[PDB]
């Protein structure tokens, strides 16, 4: 995967709600899978996973927001993050920054997509399954709701 550092325009939250889903204390549904807040009002588009009015607010906002390489300026999930992975195909043109990668995905995950050429991002890869992160069977329908 190509990297780019994010434009310059909870962590420790983050870090610990996913842990309690890993251990199963905690659904991934009743979380915002974007910033950790347990005030989840939505379902999270793309991903299964909770998603807050201030996720959703970002989001709607960081989607028409592309840098001048023609991808997004931001990650995929959090609509942040400082350093991103590209994905590799040119219809998709989405980001995966390394902290939503590590947290979601895996440790290690990051690195092992930066080392992996050509790489397809989460929501192009044929398994729809990646750690915590999966893909909804109907993100397309859902997307257009979302947006509308
Ligand atoms: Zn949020
Ligand atoms: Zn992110
Ligand atoms: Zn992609």
Same mark, same amino acid.
């Given at each position: ?14 870090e610990?709600? #996913? ?9 991934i549904?009743?979380? /915002?899978? !974007?910033?950790?807040s ?5 379902? %999270?588009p793309?991903?299964?996973?909770? $998603?807050?009015? *201030? ?18 300026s931001?990650?995929?999930?959090? /609509?942040?993050?400082?350093? #991103?992975? $590209?994905?590799? *195909? *040119? *219809? ?28 397809? /991002?989460? $929501?192009?890869? %044929? ?13 397309? !329908?859902?997307?257009? $709701?979302?947006?509308?």
């Amino acid at each position: 995967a190509r990297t780019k550092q994010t434009a310059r325009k909870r962590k420790q939250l983050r870090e610990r709600l #996913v842990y309690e889903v890993r251990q199963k204390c905690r659904n991934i549904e009743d979380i /915002c899978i !974007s910033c950790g807040s347990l005030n989840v009002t939505l379902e %999270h588009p793309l991903f299964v996973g909770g $998603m807050c009015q *201030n996720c959703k607010n970002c989001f709607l906002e960081c989607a028409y927001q592309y840098d001048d390489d023609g991808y997004q300026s931001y990650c995929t999930i959090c /609509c942040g993050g400082r350093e #991103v992975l $590209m994905c590799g *195909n *040119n *219809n998709c043109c989405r980001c995966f920054c390394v902290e939503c990668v590590d947290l979601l995905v895996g440790p290690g995950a990051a690195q092992a997509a930066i080392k992996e050429d050509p790489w397809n /991002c989460y $929501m192009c890869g %044929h398994k729809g399954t990646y750690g915590l992160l999966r893909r909804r069977e109907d993100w397309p !329908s859902r997307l257009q $709701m979302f947006f509308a």
